[PDB]
Amino acid sequence: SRILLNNGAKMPILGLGTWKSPPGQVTEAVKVAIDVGYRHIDCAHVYQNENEVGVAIQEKLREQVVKREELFIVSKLWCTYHEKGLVKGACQKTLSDLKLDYLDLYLIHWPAGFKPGKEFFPLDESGNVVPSDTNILDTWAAMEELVDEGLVKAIGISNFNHLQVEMILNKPGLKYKPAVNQIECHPYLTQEKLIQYCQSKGIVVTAYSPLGSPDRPWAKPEDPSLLEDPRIKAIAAKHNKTTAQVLIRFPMQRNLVVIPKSVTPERIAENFKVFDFELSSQDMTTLLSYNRNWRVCALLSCTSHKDYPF
Ligand SMILES: NC(=O)c1ccc[n+]([C@@H]2O[C@H](COP(=O)([O-])OP(=O)(O)OC[C@H]3O[C@@H](n4cnc5c(N)ncnc54)[C@H](OP(=O)(O)O)[C@@H]3O)[C@@H](O)[C@H]2O)c1
Ligand SMILES: O=C(O)COc1cc(Cl)ccc1C(=O)NCc1ccc(Br)cc1F
Ligand SMILES: [Br-]
Protein backbone atom coordinates (compact mmCIF):
# COMPACT_ATOMS: atom_id res chain seq x y z
CA SER A 1 0.00 0.00 0.00
CA ARG A 2 0.91 3.74 0.06
CA ILE A 3 1.85 6.49 2.49
CA LEU A 4 0.66 10.07 2.18
CA LEU A 5 3.40 12.60 1.58
CA ASN A 6 3.39 16.22 2.63
CA ASN A 7 2.88 17.23 -0.99
CA GLY A 8 -0.51 15.52 -1.08
CA ALA A 9 0.63 12.55 -3.22
CA LYS A 10 0.68 8.87 -2.16
CA MET A 11 3.93 6.89 -2.27
CA PRO A 12 4.08 3.06 -2.45
CA ILE A 13 5.78 1.79 0.69
CA LEU A 14 7.64 -0.92 -1.24
CA GLY A 15 9.91 -0.09 -4.16
CA LEU A 16 12.60 -1.76 -6.24
CA GLY A 17 16.20 -0.61 -5.71
CA THR A 18 18.56 -0.38 -8.71
CA TRP A 19 22.04 0.44 -7.39
CA LYS A 20 24.46 -2.23 -8.73
CA SER A 21 21.78 -3.76 -10.98
CA PRO A 22 23.85 -4.59 -14.07
CA PRO A 23 22.66 -2.78 -17.22
CA GLY A 24 22.17 -6.13 -18.96
CA GLN A 25 19.92 -7.42 -16.16
CA VAL A 26 18.03 -4.37 -14.89
CA THR A 27 15.63 -3.98 -17.80
CA GLU A 28 14.26 -7.49 -17.15
CA ALA A 29 14.35 -6.86 -13.37
CA VAL A 30 12.14 -3.80 -13.70
CA LYS A 31 9.76 -5.49 -16.20
CA VAL A 32 9.37 -8.41 -13.77
CA ALA A 33 8.89 -6.04 -10.85
CA ILE A 34 6.06 -4.19 -12.56
CA ASP A 35 4.48 -7.48 -13.71
CA VAL A 36 4.41 -8.82 -10.15
CA GLY A 37 3.05 -5.65 -8.56
CA TYR A 38 5.79 -3.11 -7.86
CA ARG A 39 4.79 0.44 -8.58
CA HIS A 40 7.82 2.30 -7.13
CA ILE A 41 11.34 2.22 -8.63
CA ASP A 42 14.33 3.88 -6.92
CA CYS A 43 16.89 5.24 -9.41
CA ALA A 44 19.90 7.55 -9.58
CA HIS A 45 22.03 9.06 -12.32
CA VAL A 46 25.19 7.92 -10.50
CA TYR A 47 24.03 4.24 -10.79
CA GLN A 48 24.74 4.53 -14.55
CA ASN A 49 21.74 2.37 -15.50
CA GLU A 50 18.82 4.80 -15.84
CA ASN A 51 18.61 4.29 -19.62
CA GLU A 52 18.05 0.57 -19.11
CA VAL A 53 15.56 1.14 -16.25
CA GLY A 54 13.75 3.53 -18.57
CA VAL A 55 13.51 0.95 -21.36
CA ALA A 56 11.57 -1.32 -18.90
CA ILE A 57 9.32 1.48 -17.62
CA GLN A 58 8.52 2.61 -21.15
CA GLU A 59 7.76 -0.89 -22.40
CA LYS A 60 5.31 -1.48 -19.54
CA LEU A 61 3.62 1.85 -20.20
CA ARG A 62 3.44 1.09 -23.93
CA GLU A 63 2.07 -2.42 -23.33
CA GLN A 64 -0.53 -0.80 -20.93
CA VAL A 65 0.51 -3.04 -18.08
CA VAL A 66 0.38 0.05 -15.85
CA LYS A 67 -0.61 3.71 -16.23
CA ARG A 68 1.96 6.44 -15.59
CA GLU A 69 -0.21 7.80 -12.78
CA GLU A 70 0.12 4.43 -10.99
CA LEU A 71 3.92 4.50 -11.05
CA PHE A 72 6.09 6.28 -8.48
CA ILE A 73 9.53 6.91 -10.00
CA VAL A 74 12.29 8.34 -7.82
CA SER A 75 15.71 9.61 -8.85
CA LYS A 76 18.46 11.67 -7.30
CA LEU A 77 20.65 14.70 -8.08
CA TRP A 78 24.31 13.65 -8.00
CA CYS A 79 26.89 15.64 -5.98
CA THR A 80 28.63 17.10 -9.05
CA TYR A 81 25.40 18.94 -10.01
CA HIS A 82 24.67 20.97 -6.87
CA GLU A 83 25.31 24.26 -8.80
CA LYS A 84 22.28 26.51 -9.52
CA GLY A 85 22.84 26.31 -13.25
CA LEU A 86 23.36 22.55 -13.44
CA VAL A 87 20.36 21.16 -11.44
CA LYS A 88 17.74 21.46 -14.16
CA GLY A 89 19.91 19.83 -16.81
CA ALA A 90 20.78 16.98 -14.45
CA CYS A 91 17.09 16.42 -13.83
CA GLN A 92 16.37 16.59 -17.55
CA LYS A 93 19.10 14.03 -18.33
CA THR A 94 17.50 11.65 -15.83
CA LEU A 95 14.06 12.29 -17.35
CA SER A 96 15.41 11.59 -20.84
CA ASP A 97 17.08 8.36 -19.79
CA LEU A 98 14.04 7.16 -17.86
CA LYS A 99 11.77 8.08 -20.83
CA LEU A 100 9.59 10.21 -18.52
CA ASP A 101 8.16 13.69 -18.55
CA TYR A 102 8.17 13.98 -14.76
CA LEU A 103 9.57 12.31 -11.68
CA ASP A 104 7.33 11.55 -8.72
CA LEU A 105 10.21 12.35 -6.38
CA TYR A 106 13.64 13.87 -6.87
CA LEU A 107 16.19 13.75 -4.07
CA ILE A 108 19.42 15.54 -3.24
CA HIS A 109 21.44 12.31 -3.22
CA TRP A 110 24.03 13.45 -0.63
CA PRO A 111 24.27 16.75 1.27
CA ALA A 112 27.79 17.39 -0.11
CA GLY A 113 28.40 19.17 -3.40
CA PHE A 114 31.47 18.23 -5.46
CA LYS A 115 33.32 20.10 -8.23
CA PRO A 116 31.38 19.75 -11.50
CA GLY A 117 32.87 17.87 -14.36
CA LYS A 118 32.93 14.41 -15.93
CA GLU A 119 34.09 12.60 -12.81
CA PHE A 120 31.47 11.62 -10.26
CA PHE A 121 34.12 11.75 -7.50
CA PRO A 122 36.63 14.42 -8.45
CA LEU A 123 39.73 13.92 -6.29
CA ASP A 124 42.73 16.06 -5.43
CA GLU A 125 46.16 14.56 -5.93
CA SER A 126 46.03 13.23 -2.36
CA GLY A 127 42.67 11.43 -2.79
CA ASN A 128 40.28 13.77 -1.01
CA VAL A 129 37.07 14.71 -2.81
CA VAL A 130 37.07 18.20 -4.21
CA PRO A 131 34.10 20.20 -2.83
CA SER A 132 31.75 22.68 -4.44
CA ASP A 133 31.17 25.97 -2.52
CA THR A 134 27.44 25.70 -3.12
CA ASN A 135 25.40 25.36 0.15
CA ILE A 136 22.55 22.85 0.82
CA LEU A 137 20.15 25.86 0.91
CA ASP A 138 20.89 27.15 -2.61
CA THR A 139 20.72 23.61 -3.91
CA TRP A 140 17.31 23.31 -2.25
CA ALA A 141 16.10 26.51 -3.97
CA ALA A 142 17.15 24.95 -7.28
CA MET A 143 15.14 21.81 -6.41
CA GLU A 144 12.11 23.94 -5.61
CA GLU A 145 12.28 25.37 -9.11
CA LEU A 146 11.93 21.90 -10.60
CA VAL A 147 8.56 21.58 -8.82
CA ASP A 148 7.45 24.90 -10.21
CA GLU A 149 8.60 23.94 -13.75
CA GLY A 150 6.68 20.63 -13.62
CA LEU A 151 9.69 18.37 -13.92
CA VAL A 152 9.08 16.73 -10.50
CA LYS A 153 6.00 16.28 -8.29
CA ALA A 154 7.96 16.13 -4.99
CA ILE A 155 11.45 16.92 -3.77
CA GLY A 156 13.43 15.48 -0.90
CA ILE A 157 16.78 14.68 0.60
CA SER A 158 18.96 11.63 1.20
CA ASN A 159 21.67 10.93 3.78
CA PHE A 160 20.87 14.19 5.57
CA ASN A 161 21.65 14.11 9.28
CA HIS A 162 19.50 15.81 11.91
CA LEU A 163 21.23 19.15 11.69
CA GLN A 164 21.09 19.11 7.88
CA VAL A 165 17.38 18.33 7.86
CA GLU A 166 16.87 21.13 10.37
CA MET A 167 18.87 23.50 8.15
CA ILE A 168 16.48 22.88 5.26
CA LEU A 169 13.41 23.20 7.48
CA ASN A 170 14.74 26.48 8.81
CA LYS A 171 15.69 27.85 5.40
CA PRO A 172 14.65 31.49 5.00
CA GLY A 173 11.84 31.63 2.45
CA LEU A 174 11.37 27.84 2.29
CA LYS A 175 8.79 27.16 -0.40
CA TYR A 176 8.49 23.33 -0.40
CA LYS A 177 9.45 21.20 2.58
CA PRO A 178 11.31 18.00 1.83
CA ALA A 179 8.82 15.19 1.39
CA VAL A 180 11.26 12.37 2.09
CA ASN A 181 14.64 11.71 3.68
CA GLN A 182 16.09 8.46 2.27
CA ILE A 183 18.63 6.92 4.67
CA GLU A 184 20.33 3.65 5.41
CA CYS A 185 18.18 1.60 7.80
CA HIS A 186 18.15 -2.04 8.89
CA PRO A 187 18.38 -3.98 12.17
CA TYR A 188 22.13 -3.20 12.54
CA LEU A 189 21.53 0.57 11.95
CA THR A 190 18.06 1.25 13.29
CA GLN A 191 18.14 5.03 13.14
CA GLU A 192 15.63 5.62 15.91
CA LYS A 193 16.74 9.21 16.62
CA LEU A 194 16.81 10.44 13.01
CA ILE A 195 13.55 8.67 12.12
CA GLN A 196 11.70 10.12 15.07
CA TYR A 197 12.99 13.62 14.19
CA CYS A 198 11.93 13.30 10.54
CA GLN A 199 8.56 11.75 11.29
CA SER A 200 7.85 14.49 13.86
CA LYS A 201 8.31 17.03 11.06
CA GLY A 202 6.09 15.15 8.66
CA ILE A 203 8.94 13.93 6.48
CA VAL A 204 8.57 10.34 5.27
CA VAL A 205 11.65 8.19 5.74
CA THR A 206 12.74 5.69 3.10
CA ALA A 207 14.99 2.83 4.30
CA TYR A 208 17.76 1.93 1.89
CA SER A 209 20.03 -1.14 2.06
CA PRO A 210 17.32 -2.92 4.11
CA LEU A 211 19.06 -6.27 3.55
CA GLY A 212 22.48 -4.95 4.46
CA SER A 213 23.65 -4.46 0.87
CA PRO A 214 25.54 -7.74 0.69
CA ASP A 215 26.62 -6.88 -2.87
CA ARG A 216 28.12 -3.50 -1.90
CA PRO A 217 31.51 -3.43 -3.66
CA TRP A 218 33.49 -2.81 -0.46
CA ALA A 219 32.06 -5.76 1.44
CA LYS A 220 34.48 -7.92 3.47
CA PRO A 221 33.97 -11.63 4.24
CA GLU A 222 34.09 -10.86 8.00
CA ASP A 223 31.35 -8.23 7.92
CA PRO A 224 28.01 -8.82 9.68
CA SER A 225 25.33 -10.42 7.48
CA LEU A 226 21.64 -9.69 8.16
CA LEU A 227 20.40 -12.36 5.78
CA GLU A 228 22.45 -14.96 7.66
CA ASP A 229 21.71 -13.79 11.21
CA PRO A 230 20.19 -16.83 12.93
CA ARG A 231 18.08 -14.65 15.19
CA ILE A 232 16.34 -13.09 12.20
CA LYS A 233 16.08 -16.47 10.52
CA ALA A 234 14.27 -17.67 13.60
CA ILE A 235 11.69 -14.88 13.40
CA ALA A 236 11.22 -15.64 9.70
CA ALA A 237 10.72 -19.35 10.43
CA LYS A 238 8.08 -18.57 13.02
CA HIS A 239 6.13 -16.61 10.44
CA ASN A 240 6.83 -19.13 7.56
CA LYS A 241 8.54 -16.32 5.63
CA THR A 242 12.08 -15.77 4.35
CA THR A 243 14.66 -13.68 6.17
CA ALA A 244 14.46 -11.11 3.38
CA GLN A 245 10.66 -10.88 3.81
CA VAL A 246 11.10 -10.19 7.52
CA LEU A 247 13.78 -7.54 6.73
CA ILE A 248 11.38 -5.83 4.29
CA ARG A 249 8.31 -6.03 6.56
CA PHE A 250 10.29 -4.56 9.50
CA PRO A 251 10.63 -0.99 8.11
CA MET A 252 7.07 -1.11 6.72
CA GLN A 253 5.74 -1.51 10.26
CA ARG A 254 7.80 1.49 11.38
CA ASN A 255 5.86 3.65 8.83
CA LEU A 256 8.90 3.70 6.52
CA VAL A 257 9.13 3.19 2.79
CA VAL A 258 11.61 0.41 1.86
CA ILE A 259 13.47 -0.24 -1.40
CA PRO A 260 15.17 -3.67 -1.52
CA LYS A 261 17.29 -4.30 -4.60
CA SER A 262 17.31 -7.49 -6.65
CA VAL A 263 17.99 -8.51 -10.22
CA THR A 264 16.92 -12.13 -9.56
CA PRO A 265 13.32 -12.61 -10.86
CA GLU A 266 12.36 -15.13 -8.16
CA ARG A 267 13.57 -12.79 -5.39
CA ILE A 268 11.91 -9.76 -6.91
CA ALA A 269 8.65 -11.65 -6.67
CA GLU A 270 9.35 -13.09 -3.15
CA ASN A 271 10.29 -9.67 -1.83
CA PHE A 272 6.88 -8.29 -2.81
CA LYS A 273 5.04 -10.96 -0.81
CA VAL A 274 5.08 -9.04 2.41
CA PHE A 275 1.47 -7.74 2.68
CA ASP A 276 -0.01 -10.96 4.11
CA PHE A 277 1.71 -11.22 7.52
CA GLU A 278 2.43 -9.11 10.59
CA LEU A 279 5.43 -8.94 12.84
CA SER A 280 4.36 -8.68 16.49
CA SER A 281 5.41 -5.70 18.61
CA GLN A 282 7.80 -8.03 20.43
CA ASP A 283 9.30 -9.09 17.06
CA MET A 284 9.70 -5.40 16.16
CA THR A 285 11.42 -4.50 19.43
CA THR A 286 13.62 -7.60 19.19
CA LEU A 287 14.73 -6.57 15.68
CA LEU A 288 15.38 -3.04 16.91
CA SER A 289 17.57 -4.53 19.66
CA TYR A 290 20.12 -5.75 17.06
CA ASN A 291 21.32 -2.21 16.41
CA ARG A 292 25.13 -1.95 16.33
CA ASN A 293 25.46 1.46 14.54
CA TRP A 294 26.90 -0.53 11.62
CA ARG A 295 26.83 1.56 8.51
CA VAL A 296 27.46 0.01 5.13
CA CYS A 297 27.18 3.23 3.13
CA ALA A 298 30.04 5.57 4.05
CA LEU A 299 33.14 6.68 2.15
CA LEU A 300 36.53 7.73 3.41
CA SER A 301 37.42 9.91 0.45
CA CYS A 302 34.46 12.19 1.42
CA THR A 303 34.91 12.29 5.19
CA SER A 304 36.64 15.70 5.16
CA HIS A 305 33.91 17.38 3.15
CA LYS A 306 32.27 20.12 5.27
CA ASP A 307 28.87 18.51 4.70
CA TYR A 308 29.77 14.83 5.09
CA PRO A 309 26.82 13.63 7.16
CA PHE A 310 28.24 10.91 9.40
N1 LIG B 1 20.25 7.14 -1.22
C2 LIG B 1 21.43 6.54 -1.22
O3 LIG B 1 22.49 7.07 -0.83
C4 LIG B 1 21.37 5.04 -1.35
C5 LIG B 1 22.47 4.24 -0.90
C6 LIG B 1 22.39 2.80 -1.00
C7 LIG B 1 21.23 2.26 -1.57
N8 LIG B 1 20.19 3.07 -2.04
C9 LIG B 1 18.98 2.52 -2.77
O10 LIG B 1 18.54 1.42 -1.95
C11 LIG B 1 18.46 0.18 -2.74
C12 LIG B 1 18.63 -1.04 -1.86
O13 LIG B 1 19.93 -1.02 -1.19
P14 LIG B 1 21.20 -1.88 -1.66
O15 LIG B 1 21.13 -2.10 -3.15
O16 LIG B 1 22.39 -1.22 -1.08
O17 LIG B 1 21.03 -3.29 -0.95
P18 LIG B 1 19.90 -4.27 -0.36
O19 LIG B 1 18.63 -4.02 -1.07
O20 LIG B 1 19.99 -4.20 1.11
O21 LIG B 1 20.55 -5.67 -0.78
C22 LIG B 1 20.70 -5.99 -2.18
C23 LIG B 1 21.34 -7.41 -2.19
O24 LIG B 1 20.42 -8.33 -1.60
C25 LIG B 1 20.23 -9.46 -2.43
N26 LIG B 1 18.90 -9.94 -2.25
C27 LIG B 1 17.71 -9.30 -2.59
N28 LIG B 1 16.64 -9.99 -2.29
C29 LIG B 1 17.14 -11.15 -1.71
C30 LIG B 1 16.40 -12.24 -1.21
N31 LIG B 1 15.07 -12.34 -1.18
N32 LIG B 1 17.22 -13.23 -0.69
C33 LIG B 1 18.61 -13.17 -0.68
N34 LIG B 1 19.30 -12.10 -1.18
C35 LIG B 1 18.50 -11.09 -1.70
C36 LIG B 1 20.45 -8.92 -3.83
O37 LIG B 1 20.86 -9.98 -4.71
P38 LIG B 1 20.43 -10.11 -6.27
O39 LIG B 1 20.27 -8.70 -6.82
O40 LIG B 1 21.63 -10.87 -6.84
O41 LIG B 1 19.15 -10.90 -6.30
C42 LIG B 1 21.63 -7.94 -3.62
O43 LIG B 1 22.89 -8.59 -3.61
C44 LIG B 1 19.63 0.44 -3.77
O45 LIG B 1 19.65 -0.46 -4.85
C46 LIG B 1 19.35 1.93 -4.12
O47 LIG B 1 18.20 1.91 -4.99
C48 LIG B 1 20.22 4.47 -1.94
O1 LIG C 1 25.36 6.62 -2.89
C2 LIG C 1 24.63 5.61 -3.18
O3 LIG C 1 23.43 5.61 -3.59
C4 LIG C 1 25.23 4.23 -3.04
O5 LIG C 1 26.64 4.29 -2.95
C6 LIG C 1 27.36 4.61 -4.08
C7 LIG C 1 26.84 4.35 -5.34
C8 LIG C 1 27.65 4.67 -6.44
CL9 LIG C 1 27.03 4.36 -8.02
C10 LIG C 1 28.91 5.23 -6.34
C11 LIG C 1 29.39 5.49 -5.05
C12 LIG C 1 28.63 5.19 -3.92
C13 LIG C 1 29.21 5.50 -2.56
O14 LIG C 1 30.41 5.48 -2.31
N15 LIG C 1 28.31 6.06 -1.70
C16 LIG C 1 28.83 6.62 -0.47
C17 LIG C 1 28.94 8.13 -0.40
C18 LIG C 1 28.83 8.98 -1.51
C19 LIG C 1 28.94 10.37 -1.39
C20 LIG C 1 29.15 10.92 -0.12
BR21 LIG C 1 29.28 12.74 0.23
C22 LIG C 1 29.26 10.08 0.98
C23 LIG C 1 29.16 8.71 0.85
F24 LIG C 1 29.33 7.91 1.92
BR1 LIG D 1 28.11 13.85 1.65
List, in sequence order, every residue forming a beta bridge with 12; answer none if it has no partner. Answer: 2
CA of 131 from ligand 2 middle (Å) equals 15
**Alpha carbon of 95 to those of 53, 71, 264, 282, 304: distances in Å?**
11, 14, 26, 43, 32
> Which of 180, 209, 243, 271 is the best mutation target for the ligand 1 pocket, counting ligand atoms within 8 Å of the beta carbon and taking the most?
209
**Distance (Å) from CA 123 to ligand 2 centroid:** 14
3-state SS record for the chain: CEEECCCCCEEECECEECCCCCHHHHHHHHHHHHHHCCCEEECCHHHCCHHHHHHHHHHHHHCCCCCHHHCEEEEEECHHHCCHHHHHHHHHHHHHHHCCCCECEEEECCCCCECCCCCCCCECCCCCECECCCCHHHHHHHHHHHHHCCCECCEEEECCCHHHHHHHHCCCCCCCCCCEEEEECECCECCHHHHHHHHHCCCEEEEECCCCCCCCCCCCCCCCCCCCCHHHHHHHHHCCCCHHHHHHHHHHCCCCEECCECCCHHHHHHHHCCCCCCCCHHHHHHHHCCCCCCCCCCCHHHCCCCCCCC
Experimental approach taken: X-ray
- Ligand 1 pocket member 42 (CB < 6 A): yes
Q: Is 208 one of the annotated active-site residues of the chain?
A: no
Say how far apart CA 253 and CA 278 lie, in whole Å.
Answer: 8
Residue nearest atom 32 in ligand 1 by C-alpha distance: 244
CB 186 within 8 A of CB 205: no
φ, ψ of residue 237 to 5 degrees: the values are -60, -40
| Resolution value (Å, 1 decimal) | 1.4
Among the bound ligands, the one closest to the CA of 301: 2
Distance CA 115, CA 132 (A): 5
Longest dimension (CA), the chain: 54
CATH superfamily of 1-310: NADP-dependent oxidoreductase domain (3.20.20.100)
Identify which of 73, 246, 262, 263 to mutate to test ligand 1's pocket (most ligand atoms within 8 A of the CB). Answer: 262
Q: What angle do CA 290, 291, 295 make, to 5 degrees?
A: 130
Whether residue 78 has its Cβ less than 6 Å from ligand 2: no
| Binding site membership of 299 for ligand 2 (Cβ less than 6 Å) | yes
Nearest-CA residue for atom 4 of ligand 1: 208
